[PDB]
Design a protein around this ligand. Structure first.
Ligand SMILES: *[C@@H]1O[C@H](CO)[C@@H](O[C@@H]2O[C@H](CO)[C@@H](O[C@@H]3O[C@H](CO)[C@@H](O)[C@H](O[C@H]4O[C@H](CO)[C@@H](O)[C@H](O)[C@@H]4O)[C@@H]3O)[C@H](O)[C@H]2NC(C)=O)[C@H](O)[C@H]1NC(C)=O
Ligand SMILES: *[C@@H]1O[C@H](CO)[C@@H](O[C@@H]2O[C@H](CO)[C@@H](O)[C@H](O)[C@H]2NC(C)=O)[C@H](O[C@@H]2O[C@@H](C)[C@@H](O)[C@@H](O)[C@@H]2O)[C@H]1NC(C)=O
Ligand SMILES: *[C@@H]1O[C@H](CO)[C@@H](O[C@@H]2O[C@H](CO)[C@@H](O)[C@H](O)[C@H]2NC(C)=O)[C@H](O)[C@H]1NC(C)=O
Ligand SMILES: *[C@@H]1O[C@H](CO)[C@@H](O)[C@H](O)[C@H]1NC(C)=O
Ligand code: NA
Ligand code: NA
Ligand code: NA
Ligand code: NA
Ligand SMILES: [Zn+2]
Lengths: 862, 9
């Protein structure tokens, strides 16, 4: 009879301090623990509820302190596995306010997943298997490594002890202060006590990692750890980490409080990285940089990833959301701070130019009924994991950028600094942030509209002479009335007569402003800094289209990208015809800049991905031919080198890949020649990294080229090269080779299971592989859920990646029928609702627009 | 973390 029937823990027993002893065995793959937790109770209780999941509790005792008067008593242990709780029943009720210590002895098995205290493996360059043990606790997995009050507002200090063999190294959040030999071949490592922090930030790793280190100007020792064969790839991240940690310290004037910061590259890792305080962890591909083989986008990504994890030391670690319903206070800030910090530390990366793309990523999910408000209730672990999504990260960062532009950077920064100082070593809610911002204008009412309602507004612009009428309505996909949503929208605009950014706060359904003089055109949402889209009535879109085709330089590159995106979003709600949007996209014939070119691809590629899964080869082929002809001049100018800026290199790589994939013969023939030479070199030839995706993708189209690529994958130490080979192998039209890739990465021996979600999605996007990938997901669902967990973005990626390009009623019924059959093991996943809604929109969109597109292509206006 | 696909360049 379990004496607690709620997922959330009681509020009236609070921990202060944990002493954790962990004894792991990497041979038998087991671990033993002794957890001591100092607690106080605010209410007389005889029962202590806490979290424990897959731990075998052998004994629990309660201690009542005092030098000579110290007494100890046994606790009866009950378990409620589905609530992931245990109950410790004491003989006598606890006395309110006095300190007790709970002592729990337990055992467990190292996890075979990517969470908890889990096993990771790698092979020596000689083929020898090595095993390490590492942790991943966020959000709710600390309870798989030690019993605890495993909710983020039960903060406490942690003294961690690790018993290990002499031959292995242990590292944890804090510096190692003492090592003591405790038996033959067993050493006990003592790490210093942590600051007050949440359970999900506890970390420890037992490994044979090597390290490199460098000291910040503030005296913090920063180290990168990696397997011996890869530690010579750690230099870039080490330098970036020192520069970025110094930036944050100087920026906020709030020092990093720990003596050291480690960055550990783990051979198996589910997410990109994790911000454990003092011991941040990473996929190898998110941290390790090979100067000969890594891509420009991987160098950018490492820099932004380190910036993200270091931002968390303030936004997440020092200040933590009170509950996962406000996870965006961690993840939206960390995402935003990537851009604040790297725009200063690495100005050559020009990252601010890319930021608005994150907003358009958010709008993809946020246009669907199945989105959710930025702040929204969650309770169970699957729902909590679902909060780690593009709404929390990208919408979160986007509405922060919008607010910063509205308040100004200096006022915004003053608010953030006060927020961090006031709530240091404590927890915050949505409302605490607005209070801090306002203490420096009704920020709270405004920002409640952006955090407590899902979605975003369509702003409609109607001009009569100097009179500029504005209307807001809720953007709802499928096509005009909605649930009366209303926002406080900080509008911006420029005109043909003024490129000063003008500002107007729209707080009502309708309003108007008066221009000083009549203008030839007006353009709202300058730089795409606002989380809204714009429609222009009357001649507006015709006129902005002529602007793009005549002097597309009248507005900025990101303003051009914003017009491309908005035009195609308006097609899906019936405010603009597909033909008018495609007419606008023809201006891309003369576009040179990466953001508008990439935005054009982001709107047009999905159209032929839908066609690929239908009996539509003729229109599909014509559409792809249109796309190549549209960009042919830019493609033809690309050099087959690694020259130029990061932006020039990323643009080059994607254009050459696109051209080769669509059989543009000039590019195919060059890629074939490079691939033949690479093979004849036995893989010893150094290809330009920027052409390697295209070269490998073409080479993999034959059996001998595919087999040769796979043969080289075995021995590569380069995360970029391994990603490029994986991408190429998934492009084959040989269905038995596609099945092999699914089987082998599912197995995890020749290709690590951490790559499986990506491989499944790439085959799902393959014009001949998509039936195989969808079949594989259905057949292997239970094991995939066991490995990756319900609610994980891994599972969401697999679900969307195998289904969200379907566009027929029969495919829709397959999707609805399968996921409905899962009951409590998947039927209620939010990603399932999102993919179903996406298929429903795809059906309507194709039914309405396919013949329109066919006729438009026949008009050969290009 | 979420955004880890940039190696695939
Ligand atoms: C993880 O589990 C493995 C396997 O269970 C375990 O490996 C075992 O370690 C012990 C101790 O390190 C090994 O036994 C020792 O072997 C050496 C070499 O022969 C002997 O010198 C030792 O004898 C001394 O100590 C003994 C104490 O028991 C005395 O009885 C003796 O008189 C000596 O004073 C001792 O026998 C054992 O061989 C391995 N077993 C295997 C299969 O490798 C490992 O230690 C565990 N690690 C952790 C951290 O728990
Ligand atoms: C082509 O084959 C060469 C012979 O194996 C490679 O050089 C070898 O690279 C190893 C790994 O970097 C290194 O341990 C060996 O010492 C070295 N051997 C010799 C004789 O140089 C070569 O690798 C490139 O060249 C070396 C010198 C280093 O600069 C590496 O970082 C380079 O990748 C192979 N080239 C390629 C592109 O694979
Ligand atoms: C770790 O895995 C082992 C499997 O080897 C589990 O041990 C079994 O547990 C069941 C249920 O208690 C027993 O009936 C078996 O006899 C055990 N097997 C052996 C070989 O002892 C163990 O329970 C797992 N640990 C945890 C915490 O789940
Ligand atoms: C959106 O979802 C809610 C809840 O499922 C539902 O009540 C509403 O009708 C949905 N809207 C549409 C257009 O289906
Ligand atoms: Na701009
Ligand atoms: Na704006
Ligand atoms: Na997600
Ligand atoms: Na994953
Ligand atoms: Zn994060």
């Amino acid at each position: 009879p379990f004496p607690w029937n709620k997922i959330r823990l009681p509020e009236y027993v609070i921990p202060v301090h944990y002493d954790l002893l962990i004894h792991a065995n990497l041979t038998t793959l087991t671990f033993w623990g002794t957890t001591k937790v100092e607690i106080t109770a605010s209410q007389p209780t005889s029962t202590i509820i806490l979290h424990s999941h897959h731990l075998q509790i052998s004994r629990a005792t309660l201690r009542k302190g005092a030098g000579e008067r110290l007494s100890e008593e046994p606790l009866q242990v009950l378990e409620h596995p589905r609530q992931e709780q245990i109950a410790l029943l004491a003989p006598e009720p606890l006395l309110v306010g006095l300190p007790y210590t709970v002592v729990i002895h337990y055992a467990g098995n190292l996890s075979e997943t990517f969470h908890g205290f889990y096993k990771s493996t790698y092979r020596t360059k000689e083929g020898e298997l090595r095993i390490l043990a590492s942790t991943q606790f966020e959000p709710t997995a600390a309870r798989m490594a030690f019993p605890c009050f495993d909710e983020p507002a039960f903060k406490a200090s942690f003294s961690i002890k690790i018993r290990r063999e002499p031959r292995h190294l242990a590292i944890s959040n804090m510096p190692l202060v003492k090592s003591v030999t405790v038996a033959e071949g067993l050493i006990e490592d003592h790490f210093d006590v942590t600051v007050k922090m949440s359970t999900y930030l506890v970390a420890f790793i037992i490994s044979d990692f090597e390290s490199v280190s460098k000291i910040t100007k503030s005296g913090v020792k920063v180290s990168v750890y990696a397997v011996p064969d890869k530690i010579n790839q750690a230099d870039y991240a080490l330098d970036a980490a020192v520069t970025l940690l110094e930036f944050y310290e100087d920026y906020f004037s709030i020092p990093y409080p720990l003596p050291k910061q480690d960055l550990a590259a783990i051979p198996d890792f589910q997410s990109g990285a994790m911000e454990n305080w003092g011991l941040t962890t990473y996929r190898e591909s998110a941290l390790l940089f090979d100067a000969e083989k890594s891509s420009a986008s991987s160098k950018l990504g490492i820099t932004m990833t380190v910036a993200h994890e270091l931002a968390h030391q303030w936004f997440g670690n020092l200040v933590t959301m009170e509950w996962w319903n406000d996870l965006w206070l961690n993840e939206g800030f960390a995402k935003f701070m990537e851009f604040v910090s790297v725009s200063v530390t690495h100005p050559e990366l020009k990252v601010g130019d890319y930021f608005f793309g994150k907003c358009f990523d958010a709008m993809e999910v946020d246009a669907l009924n199945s989105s959710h408000p930025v702040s929204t209730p969650v309770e169970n672990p699957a729902q909590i994991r679902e909060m780690f999504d593009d709404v929390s990260y990208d919408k979160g960062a986007c509405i922060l950028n919008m607010l910063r532009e509205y308040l100004s950077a200096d006022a915004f920064k003053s608010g953030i600094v006060q927020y961090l100082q006031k709530h240091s070593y404590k927890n915050t809610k949505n409302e605490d942030l607005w209070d801090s911002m306002a203490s420096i204008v009704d920020v709270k009412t405004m920002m409640n509209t952006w955090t407590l309602q899902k979605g975003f507004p369509l702003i409609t612009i109607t001009v009569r002479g100097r009179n500029v009428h504005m209307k807001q309505e809720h953007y709802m996909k499928g096509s005009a009335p909605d649930t009366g949503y209303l926002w406080h929208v900080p509008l911006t605009f420029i005109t043909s007569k003024s490129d000063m950014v003008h500002r107007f706060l729209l707080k009502t359904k309708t309003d108007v402003l008066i221009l000083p003089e009549e203008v030839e055109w007006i353009k709202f949402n300058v730089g795409m800094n606002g989380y809204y889209i714009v429609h222009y009535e009357d001649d507006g879109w015709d006129s902005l289209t002529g602007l793009l085709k005549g002097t597309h330089t009248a507005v900025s590159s990101n303003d051009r990208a914003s017009l491309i995106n908005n035009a195609f979003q308006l097609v899906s709600i019936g405010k603009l015809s597909i033909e008018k949007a495609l007419d606008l996209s023809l201006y891309l014939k003369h576009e040179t800049e990466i953001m508008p070119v990439f935005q054009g691809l982001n709107e047009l590629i999905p159209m032929y991905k839908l066609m690929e899964k239908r009996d539509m080869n003729e229109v599909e082929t014509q559409f792809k031919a249109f796309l190549i002809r549209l960009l042919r001049d830019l493609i033809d100018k690309q050099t087959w080198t690694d020259e130029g800026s990061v932006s020039e290199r990323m643009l080059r790589s994607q254009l050459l890949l696109l051209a080769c994939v669509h059989n543009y013969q000039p590019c195919v023939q060059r890629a074939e020649g490079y691939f033949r030479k690479w093979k004849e070199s036995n893989g010893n030839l150094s290809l330009p990294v920027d052409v390697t995706l295209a070269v490998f993708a073409v080479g993999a189209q034959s059996t001998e080229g595919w087999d040769f690529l796979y043969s080289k994958y075995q021995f590569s130490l380069s995360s970029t090269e391994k990603s490029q080979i994986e991408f190429a192998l998934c492009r084959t039209q040989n269905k038995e080779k596609l099945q092999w890739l699914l089987d082998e990465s599912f197995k995890g021996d020749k290709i690590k299971t951490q790559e499986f979600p990506q491989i499944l999605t790439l085959i799902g996007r393959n014009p001949v592989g998509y039936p195989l990938a969808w079949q594989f997901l259905r057949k292997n669902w239970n094991k995939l859920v066991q490995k990756f967990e319900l609610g994980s973005s891994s599972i969401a990626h697999m679900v969307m990646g195998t289904t969200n390009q379907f566009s027929t009623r029969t495919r829709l019924e397959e999707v609805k029928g399968f996921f409905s059959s899962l009951k409590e093991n998947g039927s209620q996943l939010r990603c399932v609702q999102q993919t179903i809604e996406t298929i429903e929109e795809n059906i309507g969109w194709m039914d309405k627009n396919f013949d329109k597109i066919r006729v438009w292509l026949q008009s050969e206006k290009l | 973390x979420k955004h880890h696909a940039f190696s695939f360049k």
